[PDB]
Design a protein around this ligand. Structure first.
Ligand SMILES: Nc1ncnc2c1ncn2[C@@H]1O[C@H](COP(=O)(O)OP(=O)(O)O)[C@@H](O)[C@H]1O
Ligand SMILES: Nc1ncnc2c1ncn2[C@@H]1O[C@H](COP(=O)(O)OP(=O)(O)O)[C@@H](O)[C@H]1O
Ligand SMILES: Nc1ncnc2c1ncn2[C@@H]1O[C@H](COP(=O)(O)OP(=O)(O)O)[C@@H](O)[C@H]1O
Ligand SMILES: Nc1ncnc2c1ncn2[C@@H]1O[C@H](COP(=O)(O)OP(=O)(O)O)[C@@H](O)[C@H]1O
Ligand SMILES: Nc1ncnc2c1ncn2[C@@H]1O[C@H](COP(=O)(O)OP(=O)(O)O)[C@@H](O)[C@H]1O
Ligand SMILES: [Mg+2]
Ligand SMILES: [Mg+2]
Ligand SMILES: [Mg+2]
Lengths: 535, 537, 147, 146, 523
């Protein structure tokens, strides 16, 4: 018996074993599938362009309406260790590619649902997991058949816009489906290093301010910071700005150590007045000798230095952030100068229309940089009607900035809309008979689970799943298999090449690879050692 | 998703390991009370009652259990008393070791239905081998078989003396109650021996009363307490005043007729007491009640009247003394006849001194010459132990006289079956041979427990025990080593034929049949569902 | 795990304290007392098998537990449940015609045919080792009282 | 609140040397109570009853009946003095001291790895020789003499 | 997810109670502020449970929703929608709340009709595009001929203040709102119009000051009024400077040198004031505090000293006098001084305020709000703030549309004309968009007590054949021409009512799952 021996002695193995939970049985694998299918059935309704959004409420009461699969599973309070691995699966897709975070959870729940009927037939769970590796290898090699792109980043941006429209077509930015798609294309190509095929997202600043509409979202080539002119009579428009970027506060120079400067006579106190009076005239003249007409400072200003800016016609901002001035020196081509004595004409930045824009009745007055000269840093200014449509557009356009980054890493594409999943399901079924020795049932469960993603698009579009999928799959066997999928309004024919539904190759290559390995770590587990109550 | 039952469900090898520990929790208790080197226990209740016993049935009946696999072994000991009567520590150890060795088989991914079918091929072969390897019936040994079989049962209890005092009283008790039946059935009803207890002198003063020992008093202290050449009148009706029934009421319309009805309730009562006493009856036994008015007629006439005796005691007296159990008046519309020729007979009815109580004895009863045993012990705890040890000793000589066949005790049967079943598993064994091979190792726990409780050598004495039994089966040179047992006082294998260690045949045949059948039911608890207690709703 | 000759029995201990060992599917589900309302209809399904047939009790839960399990993928394909109920009747009416072709007409006068039928039902119970006595006693108790 | 899967709930188990040498100390404890009530130089022992009465006596039977013990082997020694009180008159205090001393020497042999059945088989052989010794040293009494 | 729930204290719902709680929580927000819409709608009084409850009556829909604290998740989208409407245009926060709630009420009628919710989104995007062309083609521009633009500005302030507490004060408060923005003559900073609330007197006693008012009265022994003065303001430290050298002590050997240092400290503070009076000024305004040692120097020279006005007080004085901040005094030829006529002190509500009467280049105003209670002054300040923000954007965007229900029937007519040229899948969703646009004149008509079932039916029959300027006349209770009565609103205000309500109803209708997390410290 438990907690007692046959000789009457107490039988205690581990501490607090009465409040423990242990399941080996045959339902330990069944509890992992029913916990993972409910996550996949939740994310099934938010797939495709007809996917409905979800309303997420934080612990503080903040409400965020999200549609991407990365932020939905991350903002949950799920205390289930099987469903916690589905959160890290959608997070791993966002960190690597960042487009199929919703589809990688429905695919992982589809592989576990097909493995439930295979488990009742007597197949070992590692034998299903070894059969999924031999089946996912066919889906990787078949996905690299038809793949071509003609992007040159000069004038052939038409494959780049249609690739970003597939990512933005499922979000709430379909009103700006042509305007905002061209923003994310030009924001990547101006900051990407084509010699190394590396894109840095630190150069792409994504800012948002309430007011206006979604059509007022513009791609500002430069930087957008909160302007903090210390003088209210400062000119709010500079036509040709020689920007003097400095990191020294407008003050007498204070050392970093303890000084305790001694004053003995009245000649030393009169020397204190002439020291600071000549220091504020030296820090102002050393900027005017370089020909500068705009100053950026990280730290604060003194009141004595504020009026000397207006007398010399030198506008200056105050209290700029850390990485904000790092974006100014790249957008203007200037250098960040530590002191005032190291200022020169070569370390100045070049900019055109430097002005602040007031938005309605607020007092923000953000910076707008219209003209530049070969900048490697852009800033997207997202506007909207409320904060729910702006924070989602920051998440929607970030997925559009990632699919252009994946095209520079790999210039091979596929055709989405369920066209690649039906074509990959036929490749596993053709190799299931070559040979059907042991893993015949494990490969057919992989092909039946790959058809869940295109049949979820038929369910959200108001069609029938088994009626529409049987028509599309039969047309790819009777002839050579084209880019044949589905759509919501269906655009006439079902040809994905004519409807311009273009997805990246490495996006769907990591959808099958990550969902197979996450299934292998939740099939190769036969015990749960969770505790009982909290305290 | 899962089952929505409000109780508790445990599947797999969890219950398959819990039932073995439930059976081993009972076997490890009674392992210290087996054989002549076994020791008694103490059973203390919550109210303060102390019960000192070593029998396998009295311990497990008073002990509370909760597990469903534990109630099978506790009810297995209760069946051994009715079927055999001394075989009720050995069945519990075998039936728990049958589950311990079968648990090692089902952990080797062997199906339990092959273990159940493998146990039936070994249980039926064990009864077949023990019925073809007996020594002799009760004709060659004579009275030496009944005494030596009685001393084997007493060796595990408080009456295991070196002499033959308690052994001769049991054989003389069963041989005096030989009741014949139809179609040649010499039955020996051992329940007719009234076993009485009294805290008196030592165990060597236990009287063997040839007759019956009634546990009652005379009542009125004016009757002669010793009647020689007595005539027992066994009757069952209350000798009280004539009370009318519910349907009869006394509605008098004349005041002169009042006192004649009041005297009629005692005149009809005394009319029965004068016609049962004028026929020479001196001893009157009554299961009802004799009130103080009717006790005068026995003091005046000089007769003994015993009131409020048991109904089970009146049948043992009237059958042994030739008396007729009469409940009312009878014999073809007769007023008061009583059938005086059907009175009982007795040589002497004497109330002796039983250490500050009154006990009535009947000497030889003149018709059947029955027997009753009065036990004498130090305290009441020894008298309850002496009663249980004597009742198990009466059941041993009952089965020997009925079924004239004895087997050697002290592990001699379990040693011969441990080697014959290993050769039996090799001949016709394809997939169930592992269950027959573990049936032989489970039977070896009976000589193994005799070596543990004696603090002797364990893995060498039993290894020397089966060395003689192996040569008695593979070397046909008339070695006659089938009766090799254990000498627990010396620590060497001895011959149980000359030593006088005899046990009945059905104390091991019914033990191997009940332990194998109980091991099948506990082997099929692969799934167990326990619901919540429905007490307060 | 309680189906077939290689099946094991189950023991259900109720709240009163009367724990019984049972292998028949009708006796198990009446003692489990499942609180789910859809699972209580499967208890009454094995009850009517004990009334009509008597020897179909565990198998009626394996079929009905798998016909609903086969409807898990059917309800995730846009198929209406009325269409599944029409097609399950067409598979039921065709299913009896398949079992009728496998049937062999026998007579009650043949004692060897009635003996092998009763021995099959005893192979799943605890009396499978006692089928040499109980299975002849089951036939002789029936064929002498039926006329 | 789920119940704990136990067997033989709310009962104790004790075996080994703690029961063999434990019943000796319970027998030595009662024999030390009435040890000062055997000789003619004995003293009375005032007892208190749950009814409110007082039993001031030095007889070995009346003392042990007023003692409520919780030890199971201590309850056996009280029934010994009740047996000696009903059989004879002045056979009380002597049995409790003698049974405590026969168990005092029996505890010595239990430490020598000797089986308890060997000591009892030696006690029964010694009991049969104590009866024959008293019958040889006895003397017939003239009951007619006053 | 309800079946076999794997959450600790969190709950969720999918497609059953998700749209049920979203439609209940959003209609109850719109039905709350339904009674505050129109020129005859009542007002609300907002109260707390205690602990400085601070009751604040407001009729504007943004101030009601920002203080209630709704626990519903979908209702916070409409609360945040009205917050952006107050920050962008400052008007229509009540109109955008009822319109976004009437769209979801018509979307609740499409629940039982089994319409797909993505079809309603695609049907409303085409309906919103048709409604943008109705307001853009009906907008009336105003370039030259400024005597018609100033008359058009009084129709904007007369329409905004009619739906507030200032009902029978349109003869005065319209002139206080038009001339306040007209004196800016530039950008709508919306901070030069400093509103001062003083108790005592009626709302008709309120006025627009021709100069500027201030607090922190002029010194101790300084003159109270100087005619034809030169105003110089400052943002510098006067006394206890501790000038910008952290880690500097006075380490002397005797106490006689400490008396020489503290006399040298007061000489440098005297020399700083001597650099100020070299400009030839008569008034001094410092943002920081002025201690006693420079206060005696200004009083001996006959110069005023206004100490610690405000951080934004020197900005309004720089826009009303035409000077500069001038925090450093070392170049008198590069510091521009202000101009004024009278700096006399006036007494408004037993409080002496510094009146800057007769200032030059006065691009700043001061509204002296006087009311019966503090609750009226807090309502009239928000009512004037809702009127000055529209006129600050009407001078930037001169396009105006005809309000009073006329703009909503023009938008509903363009949707209904294109609803008949569409197939039946999306035409039902477009008809529900046009019915919600007709609810906005229905709420205005029913709040006065008129027959709303017939007046909107007369507006729909009028706009179906001509009558692009026909609207609802709330004065007599009939249908009149909006160009004759002069009931106009701005184009950017009416566009943000249409556009933000169509975007906010798009978010809530696309929600099929509300997964709320477990809150903290709630048990
Ligand atoms: N025009 C279209 N026609 C058909 N299918 C489409 C169309 N646009 C998008 N899809 C499908 O919608 C799906 C949206 O997946 P998504 O949720 O964005 O993945 P992730 O969560 O990884 O970003 C894609 O797999 C794509 O096949
Ligand atoms: N003199 C002896 N020598 C060896 N073994 C003995 C002797 N006397 C008894 N035994 C053994 O002691 C065991 C006592 O079993 P017991 O507990 O009486 O069974 P039950 O509980 O069924 O009555 C017997 O199996 C017998 O083999
Ligand atoms: N000798 C055998 N060999 C193979 N299978 C058997 C044998 N005997 C019985 N079975 C199987 O065991 C199953 C027992 O089913 P059972 O539980 O009796 O159904 P029900 O609960 O309806 O009575 C039968 O379906 C039968 O196929
Ligand atoms: N005068 C005496 N001299 C020596 N011994 C005595 C004398 N009188 C009494 N005794 C002893 O005192 C003992 C008293 O025993 P007692 O406690 O009366 O026994 P019980 O409890 O059975 O009555 C006797 O055994 C006796 O030997
Ligand atoms: N004189 C008038 N005639 C007709 N309608 C009017 C008049 N004045 C105001 N209204 C109407 O009253 C409504 C008031 O809306 P309001 O609550 O101010 O919106 P918000 O809260 O967004 O500022 C306006 O939509 C306008 O059409
Ligand atoms: Mg996408
Ligand atoms: Mg059956
Ligand atoms: Mg308004």
């Amino acid at each position: 018996t438990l907690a007692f021996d046959e000789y009457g002695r107490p039988f205690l193995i581990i501490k607090d074993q009465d409040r423990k939970s242990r399941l080996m049985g045959l339902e330990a694998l069944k509890s992992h599938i029913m916990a993972a299918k409910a996550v996949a059935n939740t994310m099934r309704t938010s797939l495709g362009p007809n996917g409905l959004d979800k309303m997420m409420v934080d612990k503080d009461g903040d409400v965020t309406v999200t549609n991407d699969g990365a932020t939905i599973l991350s903002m949950m309070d799920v205390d289930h260790q099987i469903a916690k691995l589905m959160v890290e699966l959608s997070k791993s897709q966002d960190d690597e590619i960042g487009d199929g975070t919703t589809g990688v959870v429905v695919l992982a729940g589809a592989l576990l649902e097909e493995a439930e009927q295979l488990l009742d037939r007597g197949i070992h769970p590692i034998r299903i997991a070894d059969g999924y590796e031999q089946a996912a290898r066919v889906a990787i090699e078949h996905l690299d058949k038809i793949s071509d792109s003609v992007l040159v980043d000069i004038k052939d941006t038409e494959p780049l816009i249609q690739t970003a429209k597939t990512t933005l077509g499922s979000k709430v930015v379909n009103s700006c489906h042509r305007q905002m798609a061209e923003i994310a294309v030009n924001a990547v190509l101006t900051v990407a290093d084509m010699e190394r095929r590396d894109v840095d997202f630190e150069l792409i600043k994504v800012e948002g301010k309430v007011g206006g509409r979604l059509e007022d979202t513009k791609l500002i080539k430069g930087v957008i910071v909160d302007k903090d002119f210390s003088h209210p009579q400062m000119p709010k428009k500079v036509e040709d700005a020689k920007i003097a970027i400095l990191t020294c506060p407008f003050e007498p120079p204070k050392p970093k150590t303890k000084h305790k400067l001694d004053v003995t006579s009245v000649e030393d106190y009169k020397a204190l007045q002439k020291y600071e009076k000549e220091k504020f005239e030296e820090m102002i003249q050393q900027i005017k000798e370089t020909g500068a007409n705009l100053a950026i400072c990280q730290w604060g200003f003194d009141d004595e230095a504020n009026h000397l800016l207006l007398q010399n016609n030198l506008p200056a901002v105050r209290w700029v952030g850390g990485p904000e001035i790092e974006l100014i020196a790249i957008a203007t081509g200037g250098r960040i100068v530590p002191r005032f004595s190291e200022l020169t004409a070569e370390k100045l930045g070049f900019a055109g229309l430097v002005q602040e824009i007031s938005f309605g009745t607020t007092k923000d007055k953000m910076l707008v940089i219209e003209q530049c000269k070969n900048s490697r840093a852009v800033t997207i200014f997202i506007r909207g009607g409320n904060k729910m449509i702006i924070e989602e557009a920051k998440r929607s356009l970030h997925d559009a900035l990632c699919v252009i980054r994946n095209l520079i890493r790999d210039n091979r594409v596929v055709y989405g809309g369920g066209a690649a999943e039906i074509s990959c399901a036929l490749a596993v079924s053709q190799e299931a008979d070559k040979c059907p020795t042991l893993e015949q049932y494990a490969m057919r469960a992989f092909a039946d689970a790959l058809e869940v993603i295109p049949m979820a698009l038929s369910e959200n579009s108001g069609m029938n799943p088994i009626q529409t999928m049987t028509e599309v799959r039969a047309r790819q066997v009777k002839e050579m298999n084209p880019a044949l999928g589905i759509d919501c309004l269906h655009k006439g024919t079902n040809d994905m090449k004519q409807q311009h539904v273009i997805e990246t190759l490495i996006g769907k290559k990591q959808q099958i690879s990550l969902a197979t390995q996450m299934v292998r770590m939740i099939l190769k587990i036969d015990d749960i050692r969770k505790p009982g109550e909290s305290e | 998703g899962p089952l929505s039952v409000f109780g508790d469900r445990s599947t797999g090898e969890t219950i398959r390991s819990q039932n073995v520990m439930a059976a081993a929790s009972i076997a490890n208790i009674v392992k210290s009370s087996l054989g002549p080197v076994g020791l008694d226990k103490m059973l203390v209740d919550d109210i303060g009652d102390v019960t000192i016993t070593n029998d396998g049935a009295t311990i497990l009946k008073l002990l509370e259990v909760e597990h469903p696999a534990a109630k099978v072994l506790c009810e297995l000991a209760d069946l051994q008393d009715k079927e055999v009567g001394d075989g009720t520590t050995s069945v519990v150890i075998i039936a728990a070791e049958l589950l311990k060795n079968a648990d090692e088989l089902v952990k080797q991914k062997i199906h339990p239905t092959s273990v159940i079918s493998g146990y039936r091929l070994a249980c039926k072969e064990a009864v077949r081998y023990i019925n073809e390897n007996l020594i002799v019936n009760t004709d060659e040994l004579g009275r030496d078989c009944l005494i030596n079989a009685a001393k084997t049962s007493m060796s595990s209890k408080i009456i295991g003396i070196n002499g033959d005092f308690f052994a001769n009283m049991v054989v003389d008790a069963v041989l005096a109650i030989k009741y014949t039946d139809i179609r040649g059935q010499p039955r020996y009803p051992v329940n007719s021996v009234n076993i009485l207890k009294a805290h008196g002198r030592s165990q060597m003063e236990s009287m063997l009363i040839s007759g019956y020992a009634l546990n009652c008093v005379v009542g009125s202290q004016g009757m002669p307490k010793r009647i020689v050449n007595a005539k027992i009148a066994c009757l069952d009706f209350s000798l009280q005043k004539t009370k009318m029934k519910l349907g009869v009421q006394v509605v008098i319309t004349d005041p002169e007729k009042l006192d004649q009805i009041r005297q009629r309730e005692s005149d009809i009562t005394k009319e029965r007491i004068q016609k049962i006493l004028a026929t020479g009856a001196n001893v009157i036994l009554t299961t009802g009640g004799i009130d103080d008015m009717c006790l005068k007629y026995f003091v005046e006439a000089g007769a003994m009247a015993v009131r409020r005796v048991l109904k089970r005691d009146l049948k043992r007296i009237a059958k042994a003394s030739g008396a007729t159990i009469l409940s009312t008046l009878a014999n073809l519309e007769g007023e008061e006849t009583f059938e005086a020729a059907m009175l009982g007979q007795a040589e002497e009815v004497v109330q002796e001194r039983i250490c500050d109580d009154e006990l009535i004895l009947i000497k030889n009863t003149k018709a059947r010459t029955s027997a009753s045993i009065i036990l004498r012990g130090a305290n009441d705890f020894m008298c309850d132990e002496m009663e249980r040890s004597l009742h198990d000793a009466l059941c041993v000589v009952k089965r020997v006289l009925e079924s004239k066949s004895v087997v050697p005790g002290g592990g001699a049967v379990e040693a011969a079956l441990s080697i014959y079943l290993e050769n039996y598993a090799t001949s016709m064994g394809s997939r169930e041979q592992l269950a027959i091979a573990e049936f032989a190792r489970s039977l070896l726990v009976i000589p193994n427990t005799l070596a543990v409780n004696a603090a002797q050598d364990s893995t060498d004495l039993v290894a020397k025990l089966r060395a003689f039994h192996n040569e008695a089966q593979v070397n046909p040179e008339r070695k006659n080593l089938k009766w090799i047992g254990l000498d627990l006082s010396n620590g060497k294998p001895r011959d149980n034929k000359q030593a006088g260690v005899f046990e009945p045949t059905i104390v091991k045949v019914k033990s191997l049949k009940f332990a194998t059948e109980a091991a099948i039911t506990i082997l099929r608890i692969d799934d167990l569902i326990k619901l919540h207690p429905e007490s307060k709703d | 795990t309680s189906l077939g000759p290689k099946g094991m029995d189950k023991m259900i201990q109720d709240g009163k304290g009367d724990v019984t060992i049972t292998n028949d599917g009708a006796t198990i589900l009446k003692q489990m007392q499942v609180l789910h309302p859809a699972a209580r209809m499967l208890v009454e399904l094995s009850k009517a098998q004990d009334i009509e047939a008597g020897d179909g009790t565990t198998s009626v839960v394996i079929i009905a537990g798998s016909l609903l399990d086969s409807c898990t993928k059917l309800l995730q394909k846009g198929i209406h449940p009325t269409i599944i109920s029409e097609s399950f009747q067409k598979a039921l009416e065709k299913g009896i015609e398949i079992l009728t072709d496998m049937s062999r007409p026998v007579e009650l006068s043949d004692r060897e045919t009635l003996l092998n039928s009763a021995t099959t039902s005893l192979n799943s119970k605890v009396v499978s080792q006692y089928s040499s006595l109980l299975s002849p006693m089951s036939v002789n108790a029936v064929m002498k009282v039926i006329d | 609140h789920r119940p704990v899967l136990v067997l033989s709930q709310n009962t104790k188990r004790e075996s080994g040397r703690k029961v063999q040498s434990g019943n000796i100390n319970a027998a030595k404890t009662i024999a030390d109570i009435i040890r000062t009530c055997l000789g003619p130089k004995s003293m009375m022992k005032m007892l208190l009853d749950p009814m409110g009465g007082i039993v001031m006596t030095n007889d070995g039977n009346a003392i042990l009946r007023e003692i409520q013990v919780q030890h199971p082997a201590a309850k056996s020694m009280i029934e010994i003095s009740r047996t000696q009180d009903e059989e004879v008159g002045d056979g009380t205090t002597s049995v409790i001291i003698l049974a405590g001393e026969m168990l005092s020497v029996a505890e010595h042999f239990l430490e020598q790895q000797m089986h308890p059945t060997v000591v009892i088989s030696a006690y029964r052989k010694a009991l049969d020789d104590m009866i024959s010794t008293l019958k040889k040293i006895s003397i017939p009494v003239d009951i007619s003499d006053s | 997810a309800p079946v076999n729930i794997f959450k600790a204290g969190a709950d969720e719902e999918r497609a059953e109670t998700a749209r049920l709680t979203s439609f209940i929580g959003a209609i109850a927000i719109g039905d709350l502020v339904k009674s505050t819409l129109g020129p005859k709608g009542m007002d609300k009084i907002l109260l707390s449970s205690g602990r400085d409850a601070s009751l604040m009556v407001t009729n504007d829909g943004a101030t009601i929703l920002k203080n209630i604290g709704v626990d519903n998740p979908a209702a916070k989208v409409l609360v945040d929608m009205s917050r952006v409407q107050d920050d962008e245009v400052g008007d229509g926060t009540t109109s955008v709340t009822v319109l976004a709630a009437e769209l979801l009420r018509e979307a609740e009628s499409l629940i039982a009709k089994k319409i797909h919710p993505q079809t309603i989104i695609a049907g409303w995007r085409e309906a919103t595009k048709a409604a943008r062309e109705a307001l853009l083609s009906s907008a009336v521009d105003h370039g030259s001929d400024e005597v018609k633009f100033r008359q058009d500005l009084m129709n904007i302030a007369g329409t905004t203040l009619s739906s507030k507490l200032l009902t029978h004060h349109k003869d005065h408060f319209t002139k206080l709102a038009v001339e306040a923005v007209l004196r800016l003559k530039g950008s709508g900073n919306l901070e030069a119009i400093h509103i001062i609330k003083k108790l005592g007197g009626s709302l008709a006693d309120s006025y627009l000051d021709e100069g500027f008012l201030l607090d922190k009265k002029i010194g101790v022994n300084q003159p109270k009024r100087i005619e034809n003065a030169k105003i110089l303001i400052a943002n510098t430290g006067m006394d206890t400077d501790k000038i910008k050298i952290f880690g500097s002590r006075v380490r002397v050997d005797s106490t006689a040198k400490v008396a020489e240092i503290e006399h040298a400290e007061k000489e440098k503070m005297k020399e700083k004031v001597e650099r100020i009076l070299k400009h030839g000024i008569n008034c001094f305004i410092n943002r920081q505090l002025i201690y006693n040692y420079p206060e005696q120097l200004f009083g001996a020279a006959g110069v005023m000293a206004i100490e610690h006005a405000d951080f934004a007080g020197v900005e309004r004085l720089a826009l009303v006098t035409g000077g500069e901040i001038a925090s450093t005094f070392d170049h008198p030829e590069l510091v521009k001084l202000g101009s004024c006529k009278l700096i006399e002190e006036v007494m408004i509500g037993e409080d002496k305020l510094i009146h800057f009467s007769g200032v030059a280049l006065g691009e700043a105003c001061t509204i002296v709000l006087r009311g019966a209670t503090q609750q009226i002054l807090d309502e009239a300040e928000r009512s004037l703030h809702d009127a000055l923000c529209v006129l600050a954007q009407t001078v930037k965007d001169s396009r105006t549309v005809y309000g009073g229900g006329c703009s909503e029937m023009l938008m509903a007519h363009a949707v209904t004309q294109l609803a008949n040229r569409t197939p039946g899948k999306e035409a039902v969703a477009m008809e529900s968009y046009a019915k919600a646009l007709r609810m906005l004149p229905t709420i205005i008509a029913d709040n006065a007590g008129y027959d709303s079932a017939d007046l909107v039916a007369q507006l729909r029959a009028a706009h179906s054949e001509g009558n692009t300027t026909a609207g609802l006349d709330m004065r007599e209770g009939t249908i009149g021409d909006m160009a004759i009565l002069g009931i106009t609103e701005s184009f950017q205000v009416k566009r943000q009512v249409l556009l933000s309500a169509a975007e906010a109803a798009e978010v809530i209708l696309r929600v099929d799952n509300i997964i709320k997390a477990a809150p903290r410290k709630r048990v």
